[PDB]
Design a protein around this ligand. Structure first.
Ligand SMILES: CCCCCCCCCCCCCCCCCC(=O)OC[C@H](COP(=O)([O-])OCC(O)COP(=O)([O-])OC[C@@H](COC(=O)CCCCCCCCCCCCCCCCC)OC(=O)CCCCCCCCCCCCCCCCC)OC(=O)CCCCCCCCCCCCCCCCC
Ligand SMILES: CCCCCCCCCCCCCCCCCC(=O)OC[C@H](COP(=O)([O-])OCC(O)COP(=O)([O-])OC[C@@H](COC(=O)CCCCCCCCCCCCCCCCC)OC(=O)CCCCCCCCCCCCCCCCC)OC(=O)CCCCCCCCCCCCCCCCC
Ligand SMILES: CCCCCCCCCCCCCCCCCC(=O)OC[C@H](COP(=O)([O-])OCC(O)COP(=O)([O-])OC[C@@H](COC(=O)CCCCCCCCCCCCCCCCC)OC(=O)CCCCCCCCCCCCCCCCC)OC(=O)CCCCCCCCCCCCCCCCC
Ligand SMILES: CCCCCCCCCCCCCCCCCC(=O)OC[C@H](COP(=O)([O-])OCC(O)COP(=O)([O-])OC[C@@H](COC(=O)CCCCCCCCCCCCCCCCC)OC(=O)CCCCCCCCCCCCCCCCC)OC(=O)CCCCCCCCCCCCCCCCC
Ligand SMILES: CCCCCCCCCCCCCCCCCC(=O)OC[C@H](COP(=O)([O-])OC[C@H](O)COP(=O)([O-])OC[C@H](COC(=O)CCCCCCCCCCCCCCCCC)OC(=O)CCCCCCCCCCCCCCCCC)OC(=O)CCCCCCCCCCCCCCCCC
Ligand SMILES: CCCCCCCCCCCCCCCCCC(=O)OC[C@H](COP(=O)(O)OCCN)OC(=O)CCCCCCCCCCCCCCCCC
Ligand SMILES: CCCCCCCCCCCCCCCCCC(=O)OC[C@H](COP(=O)(O)OCCN)OC(=O)CCCCCCCCCCCCCCCCC
Lengths: 98, 171, 347, 105, 120, 140, 175, 80, 115
């Protein structure tokens, strides 16, 4: 297939491995979920604008909506981690190991 | 697969309408009135054949009928039309609303010297019927035999033979 | 929580599962999963302690990663098929990514690393919601894409889930982690029979949901979250020890109980397809699940662990709890095996 | 559990964004409308197992409409052979592939 | 297996052709076992709330029995329908494909040679 | 590494011992790399040197198991002249189990791995003979 | 090399993704994600989606301003890692960049490449439509159809945003 | 209802104006005779090409020319 | 093309007003003038301490309300449709759902700041 899908899928995989390998800091990986949403947006939108399947043009908007509709969720779940502990480090969330 | 079959370069040579887009847009309503029939035969052939290679000859009729539209403007009303497409040609979006006095002069000179009525608001968007002698294409998608569907269910539904037959359940 | 808000949030969890179940479009599947996760996060944080916040963070990260992989599988299907219908997938890469996404959403091994954590962190009612109602939407999507599921992938996920969920519960004294590794092993049983006969997948799902809802309703009715607090039940309500006895012996796959019903039928559908080694290893590995079930029956019903003095006060107070459908679910989880050919209604 | 509520109740919740050949706003066609219409009218009702092998040709034409892989591979071959013949000097491009050609309309 | 059968008529618990089948009797032993499950649910319900198990709540035990018999009647109707569909599709597929199901010629045991394995 | 097991099994038994030993060595090395990857994943090594030490230790352990398995199996198929015979892989699996015991530096793990890996390799040979399917394709 | 403009913007997209995916600090993570979401509205704007690129630019600008406020309020350390302070950040940053320009080099020299899928190496101008859409941009018509055709999608999206507000106010309570 | 309305107009008048404008925007398009003409203008705006019909022989309502009397007209939009 | 030329010109003579702002005057660097500013006295602690956000619930709800102007924004184009009462109903449904959201955030004191 076309050349740009290589790099947009590459950016998805880069953001995937960035999300899936934590650096002990939860906000730095909540950016990686938002980057995966960006890469899925641009990939789906290139496919939809390419093929002129115009009725799915409303699809990435909807996709983008649920992007922040979980990203806000993560931030609402970031502040409860950072109120229990002074930092949002992910290694403070190990109480459920026993 | 197969060789794609394209027409030759001599098959595509026709006397083009070598005028600009403002010249076309200025004469557009009278073109839609007077050059109705070969244009609609062509667009009917174009949506029915779904292939431009089977639409060249009718298309040439379009390129035959447009030029005779303009020569009949050029023989009679060349100067009011020239002023009118110049005034249309000035604008960026090419507004009809900025050029109503040259439009009135052009429509008056055309209606006097040639007897053409300008189409009103709503007429050129009508769906019209076209009388052609070319055959209706029986397979414009170049499709093939659709596969045979699975056989339906028929017959009265009898009870299950000896129940469920699940290892020992006798019902 | 304000009970109007609790009603609206639980109806939104149900709405997300229904939107996954009824929709023919992939974007609506993804919307249903997003709505399901988004609404179930405050059910986990109903109590506002650090363990519920940790469980909700781990659950959000796992389910968000799974939904990313799901939408990437959807977009690759859009490329290689030009359409959005919820049916088989037209690319093995999208098939793998969607199978990984649904295996993460089920908590099947080796993506199982959140189910004991999240199940221990949250209450017993929200743990019941997690282990039963959240196992309905990915099993819908797995029921719908089985012409494209890789055989080796779903069988590796299935037997790896059965083995890891067997070994995990042996080292547990917390009841919620026991039910979570039990969940892992049972989802392995359900997905192993998925490509052979998905009616048996639905049968195992329904019998599992009945038995798990019975066990969580018994835990809530006794207010027990550890093994050693479940062991005081003989001194307080001795009928509950009988009910956890019959339900835990049912969950181990022992005849003549209904939890023997799915397992046997799964074996009954895997030997038809000339697979003899795999359901044999699955059956033998289910003895580990049976072993920690038998450990709980030893601590609760078959012996009498020593109680405390303050139990004498709880003799004077009956249960005012809504033990909703507990006798119905206890009868259905134990005495349903003579009605085994009822599974044909799931065809 | 495909509880087909949309066909039971007769409602159209999401059948409209399902395929490219559906009813589009202002009758806009997709670039692969004919290929997808041929593939769907081939594979309708015959089930997926017969559709994966009896409608393989229409689905190959439709997939090669979508991603244009054979077309871009053929253009790779044509452009690479053209660049090789330019590099060897054994071919010169015509004037209508350089600009000075007094284009059609 | 039979998922493509119930796709032209979706979400029908009992279709119209299910009325061409004999319904279960009200003295069906499967239905009597489901009623016994209702009675056992009533007994467990009186047991866990520490009521007298046989004497308390006869209206409640009777609605347990009535509700299980009522649900189980339609469950047995759908069960018998799906097995009748299974047999109907089996027989129609055997009839529509004779080349896949040849008529076997059962040889008698005077021509069938079996190797004798002596137990000594 | 679907092709690793294929290039192990595409060779007749008791014919070319070095290539069988190398193929089983590579199968063991891939298994040891998988175990090493999950081992440095779930249990954090204290340093990068300790991580590559655990990786090399598990990889050389499983590769030595594979090497001695393939060597013992093909040498037994040569000296016994019975290539389609599960007793060859029983002896090879016990040799691999003694290898695993010598790598874990204990006799009881060696005897237990001898018994169970010999039975496992015997069952693998019987599955190659009668065509047993563990990941069986759905037929009905 | 101007026909490769969508490819060049896509290289800058992957460079921004390696920038914030190495996770230096969410200040510079927000920087890299703004750079990627700002060249990604130049990738997709050259396909005809001028509405649908400006929105992923604008929504993510609001998003990274919010994320900035939180990483200055919650995710803050005394010495934030810029791009090069940690060896594990700089190592995987250089690794992602070298592997990205490696698959640039293998796709411009060979004009084909294969990582899991097969990809062309010609400029992606080749796949555009040779026609015109008239007096409507078709992506604007399709997003306008969210109100006429997308009624169920409106209902589930508006309900999800409503319960998103309700869910977030139920989480961020503490008691 | 009038005393509460005066109270909320005295305390929160921005919200009173908000609910008034919102209530008008809800109820008033259902009470206007011109909402029909919105739809009639929008479906008489010719974006696409009016693809002609093959004359089978029996279509009395379809014209053969745009200046023919039969067919859909837009005199209602010219007058209004 | 012209857009990238214009942005290149703007960025170029915004960065060439900086390179002649640093390199043109005479520099006198000593390690007290480049110190941070705390009204003359030395700053107590770093400014990289967590500065706690009081408006955090409003900041998260801004992420949700900013999506609404990705949904309410096609209304000038949605008004051009030929299924127009349905469009009007869905538009008023989206603004009404935004308003119900804002009312819920009001009455549960989500718009107020903490402390
Ligand atoms: C019937 C079976 C189910 C009964 C459930 C309720 C049992 C109960 O509570 O009994 C108490 C009650 C007597 O209690 P009570 O004097 O009122 O007061 C309570 C006592 O104080 C009791 O004292 P307590 O409760 O304070 O404490 C003592 C404690 C004592 O407990 C302990 O000490 C702890 C446990 C001791 C060790 C474990 C022993 C084994 C217990 C489990 C059973 C395992 C085997 C079952 C199969 C395997 C399952 C794993 O608990 C009990 O004694 C409770 C009694 C439970 C006995 C029955 C257990 C039922 C559940 C398990 C069996 C059924 C499900 C599985 C079956 C699968 C297929 C075979 O017993 C009865 O009344 C028995 C029934 C007799 C009449 C039957 C009439 C039948 C009529 C049928 C025809 C009409 C209907 C037609 C319908 C169809 C129409 C179409
Ligand atoms: C269509 C499919 C329908 C499936 C069944 C749906 C209903 C049952 C499940 C829903 C549920 O949670 O019900 C709560 C449940 C009570 O909750 P609980 O904690 O289990 O009850 C404990 C005490 O019995 C509570 O006692 P109480 O002090 O509240 O007063 C007595 C109470 C008073 O209630 C009333 O008077 C209700 C009056 C209104 C009824 C609705 C008309 C409006 O009556 C009962 O509780 C009678 C026993 C209820 C049995 C529940 C299970 C029924 C059968 C479920 C399916 C079994 C399938 C077996 C198949 C085996 C083979 C696979 O039942 C009711 O409130 C009414 C049940 C009505 C059953 C109708 C069945 C046919 C429907 C068509
Ligand atoms: C050819 C390529 C293809 C092959 C098939 C595919 C490859 C995978 C094979 C199957 C899976 C193997 C196990 C993988 C995980 C290993 C366990 C682990 O994490 O250990 C760390 C850790 C152990 O460390 P620890 O707890 O700190 O204690 C260690 C002591 O302190 C210190 O004790 P230590 O010094 O003794 O060290 C402990 C370590 C040391 O063990 C070793 O170094 C032994 C390495 C293997 C030796 C045997 C190799 C035999 C090769 C076959 C024969 C060659 C010729 C074949 C010819 C054809 C056939 C005849 O032993 C263990 O970890 C024991 C448990 C694992 C046994 C694995 C046996 C694999 C046999 C493969 C046969 C093929 O255990 C855990 O963390 C357990 C929890 C893990 C939970 C998740 C597990 C998921 C596993 C998924 C794997 C497959 C993924 C599928 C993806 C697709 C579907 C989604
Ligand atoms: C497989 C090979 C065994 C791997 C696990 C062994 C246990 C863990 C271990 O090594 O711990 C030591 C060590 C640290 O543990 P530890 O804390 O020191 O514990 C030991 C104490 O120091 C205590 O000191 P110790 O080392 O002297 O005592 C340990 C004891 C040593 O044993 C003794 O001291 C007495 C026993 C003598 C040898 C056993 C004789 C068995 C005879 C056959 C059984 C009866 C058959 C009857 C019928 C015959 C005809 C069919 O060994 C065991 O307990 C191992 C028992 C057998 C394990 C496999 C059982 C599978 C059952 C599946 C269902 C059936 O962990 C490791 O080294 C981890 C890595 C282990 C090897 C990696 C995995 C290799 C997998 C290869 C492929 C396997 C494919 C599947 C085969 C099985 C399913 C068919
Ligand atoms: C004028 C118009 C009106 C006229 C009315 C005339 C009639 C008036 C009465 C109507 C009401 C029905 C009365 C019963 C009808 C006959 C049913 C019968 O005996 O079937 C024999 C049935 C098959 O025998 P058969 O020699 O092939 O055929 C004789 C009939 O013609 C069999 O005929 P079939 O071919 O039609 O039978 C169908 C099929 C035939 O059976 C089969 O295809 C074989 C497979 C059956 C299921 C096997 C499951 C095995 C694994 C689970 C085992 C669970 C534990 C075992 C029990 C432990 C105790 C709880 O049965 C089933 O599919 C149903 C499942 C079995 C339920 C039987 C009905 C029980 C009702 C009362 C429940 C009381 C508790 C019963 C025990 C609970 C467990 C069932 O026997 C068994 O399966 C063995 C178990 C014994 C059956 C139940 C005995 C009923 C009377 C119990 C009185 C004492 C209760 C003491 C308290 C409760 C226990 C603690
Ligand atoms: C054999 C042998 O040498 O066993 C000794 C070994 C323990 O040796 P160690 O004492 O460590 O020196 O012992 C072991 O490693 C454990 C036992 C080795 C295998 C014994 C097999 C026969 C056992 C009796 C089977 C009866 C049936
Ligand atoms: C308790 C545990 C019991 C295990 C019993 C396993 C029995 C063997 C089943 C697998 C096997 O060896 O099947 C034979 C097969 C070679 O035959 P075939 O199917 O023709 O392979 C060509 C590929 N189409 O071989 C293959 O398909 C590939 C080789 C499979 C090897 C499986 C064992 C791996 C090592 C142990 C784990």
């Amino acid at each position: 297939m076309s050349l740009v899908y290589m790099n947009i899928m590459m950016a998805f995989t880069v953001s995937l491995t960035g999300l899936l390998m934590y650096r002990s800091h939860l906000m730095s990986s909540l950016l990686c979920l938002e980057g995966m949403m960006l890469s899925l947006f641009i990939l789906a939108t290139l496919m939809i604008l390419n093929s002129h399947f115009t009725l799915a043009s409303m699809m990435p908007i909807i996709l983008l909506v649920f992007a922040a509709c979980e990203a806000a969720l993560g931030l609402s779940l970031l502040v409860m981690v950072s109120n229990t502990y002074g930092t949002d480090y992910v290694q403070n969330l190990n109480l459920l190991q026993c | 697969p197969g060789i794609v079959e394209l027409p030759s370069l001599e098959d595509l040579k026709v006397q083009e309408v070598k005028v600009s887009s403002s010249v076309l847009k200025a004469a557009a309503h009278h073109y839609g009135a007077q050059c109705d029939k070969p244009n609609k035969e062509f667009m009917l052939c174009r949506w029915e054949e779904k292939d431009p290679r089977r639409c060249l000859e009718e298309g040439k009729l379009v390129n035959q009928c447009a030029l005779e539209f303009f020569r009949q403007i050029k023989r009679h009303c060349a100067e009011p039309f020239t002023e009118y497409w110049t005034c249309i040609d000035y604008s960026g979006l090419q507004l009809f609303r900025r050029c109503r006095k040259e439009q009135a002069q052009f429509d008056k000179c055309v209606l006097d010297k040639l007897g053409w009525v300008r189409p009103d608001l709503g007429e050129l968007s009508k769906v019209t019927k076209v009388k052609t002698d070319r055959p209706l294409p029986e397979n414009p998608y170049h499709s093939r035999a659709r596969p045979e569907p699975n056989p339906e269910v028929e017959g009265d539904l009898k009870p299950a033979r000896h129940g469920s037959r699940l290892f020992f359940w006798t019902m | 929580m304000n009970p109007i808000i609790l009603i609206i949030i639980l109806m939104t969890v149900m709405l997300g599962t229904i939107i996954v179940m009824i929709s023919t479009h992939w974007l609506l599947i993804w919307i249903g999963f997003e709505m399901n996760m988004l609404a179930i996060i405050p059910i986990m944080m109903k109590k506002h302690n650090p363990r519920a916040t940790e469980a909700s963070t781990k659950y959000f990260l796992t389910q968000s990663t799974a939904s990313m992989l799901l939408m990437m599988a959807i977009i690759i299907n859009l490329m290689f098929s030009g359409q959005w219908t919820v049916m088989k997938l037209f690319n093995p890469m999208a098939s793998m990514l969607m199978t990984m996404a649904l295996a993460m959403k089920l908590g099947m091994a080796p993506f199982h690393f959140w189910v004991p954590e999240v199940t221990q962190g949250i209450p017993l009612s929200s743990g019941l919601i997690l282990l039963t109602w959240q196992k309905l939407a990915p099993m819908s999507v797995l029921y719908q894409i089985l012409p494209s599921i890789n055989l080796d992938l779903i069988l590796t996920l299935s037997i790896l889930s059965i083995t890891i969920g067997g070994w995990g519960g042996l080292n547990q004294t917390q009841l919620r982690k026991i039910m979570a590794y039990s969940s892992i092993a049972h989802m392995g049983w359900m997905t192993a029979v998925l490509l052979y006969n998905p009616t048996m997948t639905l049968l195992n799902l329904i019998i599992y949901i009945i038995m798990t809802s019975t066990m969580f309703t018994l835990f809530m009715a006794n207010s027990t979250t550890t093994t050693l607090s479940l062991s005081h039940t003989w001194n307080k309500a001795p009928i509950m020890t009988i009910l956890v006895l019959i339900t835990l012996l049912s969950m181990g796959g022992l005849p003549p109980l209904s939890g023997f019903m799915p397992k046997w039928m799964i074996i009954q559908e895997m030997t038809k397809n000339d697979s003899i080694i795999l359901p044999t290893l699955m059956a033998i590995t289910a003895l580990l699940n049976l072993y920690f079930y038998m450990r709980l029956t030893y601590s609760t019903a078959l012996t009498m662990f020593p109680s405390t003095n303050n139990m004498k006060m709880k003799w004077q107070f009956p249960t005012t709890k809504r033990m909703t459908l507990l006798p119905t679910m206890t009868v259905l989880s134990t005495m349903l095996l003579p009605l085994t050919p009822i599974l044909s209604i799931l065809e | 559990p495909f509880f087909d509520v949309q066909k039971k109740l007769g409602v159209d919740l999401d059948h409209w964004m399902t395929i490219q050949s559906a009813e589009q706003p202002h009758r806009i066609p997709a670039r692969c409308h004919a290929f997808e219409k041929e593939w769907i009218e081939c594979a309708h009702g015959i089930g997926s197992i017969r559709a994966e092998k009896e409608c393989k040709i229409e689905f190959e034409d439709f997939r090669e409409c979508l991603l244009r892989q054979k077309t871009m591979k053929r253009l790779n071959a044509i452009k690479r052979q053209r660049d090789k013949l330019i590099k060897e000097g054994k071919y010169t491009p015509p004037p209508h592939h350089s600009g000075q050609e007094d284009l059609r309309p | 297996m039979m998922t493509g059968r119930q796709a032209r008529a979706p979400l029908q618990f009992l279709p119209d052709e299910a009325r061409s089948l004999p319904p279960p009797k009200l003295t069906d032993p499967r239905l009597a076992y489901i009623g016994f499950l209702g009675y056992c649910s009533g007994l467990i319900d009186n047991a866990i709330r520490r009521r007298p198990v046989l004497s308390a709540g006869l209206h409640r035990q009777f609605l347990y029995i009535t509700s299980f018999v009522f649900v189980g009647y339609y469950l047995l109707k759908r069960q018998d329908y799906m097995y009748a569909v299974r047999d109907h599709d089996m027989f129609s597929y055997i009839k529509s494909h004779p080349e896949d199901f040849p008529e076997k010629d059962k040889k008698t045991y005077r021509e069938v040679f079996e190797e004798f394995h002596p137990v000594r | 590494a679907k092709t690793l097991l294929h290039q192990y099994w595409d060779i007749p038994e008791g014919t070319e011992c070095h290539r069988k030993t190398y193929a089983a060595t590579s199968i063991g090395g891939a298994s040891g790399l998988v175990v090493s990857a999950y081992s440095v994943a779930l249990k954090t090594p204290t340093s990068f040197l300790e991580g590559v030490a655990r990786t090399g230790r598990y990889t050389f352990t499983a590769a030595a198991i594979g090497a001695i398995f393939g060597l013992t199996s093909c040498i037994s198929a040569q000296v016994r002249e019975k290539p389609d015979d599960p007793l060859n892989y029983l002896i090879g699996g016990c040799a691999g189990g003694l290898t695993l015991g010598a790598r874990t530096r204990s006799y009881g793990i060696g005897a237990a791995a001898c018994a169970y890996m010999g039975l496992t390799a015997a069952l693998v040979k019987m599955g190659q003979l009668e065509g047993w399917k563990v990941f069986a394709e759905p037929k009905v | 090399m101007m026909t490769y403009i969508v490819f060049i913007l896509s290289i800058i997209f992957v460079m921004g993704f390696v920038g914030f995916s190495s996770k230096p600090s969410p200040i510079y993570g927000g920087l890299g994600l703004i750079v990627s979401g700002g060249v990604g509205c130049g990738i997709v704007l050259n396909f005809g989606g001028s509405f649908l690129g400006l929105m992923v630019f604008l929504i993510y600008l609001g998003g990274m301003m919010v994320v900035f406020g939180y990483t200055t309020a919650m995710a803050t350390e005394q010495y934030p890692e810029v791009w090069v302070s940690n060896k594990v950040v700089l190592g995987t940053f250089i690794t992602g960049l070298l592997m990205e320009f490696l698959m640039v080099y293998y796709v411009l020299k060979d004009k084909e490449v294969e990582i899991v899928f097969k990809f062309n190496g010609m400029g992606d101008w080749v796949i555009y439509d040779t026609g015109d859409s008239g007096f409507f941009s078709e992506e604007a018509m399709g997003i306008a159809a969210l109100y006429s055709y997308g009624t169920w999608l409106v209902i589930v999206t508006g309900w999800s945003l409503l319960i998103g507000v309700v869910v977030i106010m139920e989480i961020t309570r503490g008691n | 209802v009038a005393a509460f309305l005066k109270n909320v107009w005295a305390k929160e008048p921005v919200l009173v104006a908000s609910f008034a404008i919102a209530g008008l925007a809800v109820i008033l398009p259902t009470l206007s005779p011109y909402t029909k003409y919105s739809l009639m203008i929008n479906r008489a705006t010719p974006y696409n090409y009016p693809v002609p019909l093959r004359d089978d022989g029996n279509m009395p309502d379809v014209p053969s020319h745009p200046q023919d009397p039969q067919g859909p007209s837009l005199e209602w939009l010219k007058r209004l | 093309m012209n857009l990238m030329i214009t942005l290149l010109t703007n960025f170029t003579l915004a960065t060439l007003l900086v390179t002649i702002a640093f390199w043109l005057p005479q520099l006198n660097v000593y390690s007290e003038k480049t110190s941070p500013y705390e009204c003359g006295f030395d700053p107590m602690g770093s400014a990289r301490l967590p500065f706690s956000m009081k408006f955090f619930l409003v900041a998260i709800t801004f992420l949700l309300f900013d999506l609404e102007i990705a949904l309410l924004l096609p209304l000038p184009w949605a008004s051009q449709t030929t299924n127009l009462n349905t469009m009007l109903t869905m538009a008023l449904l989206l603004i009404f759902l935004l308003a119900v959201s804002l009312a819920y955030e009001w009455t549960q004191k989500g718009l107020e700041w903490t402390e």
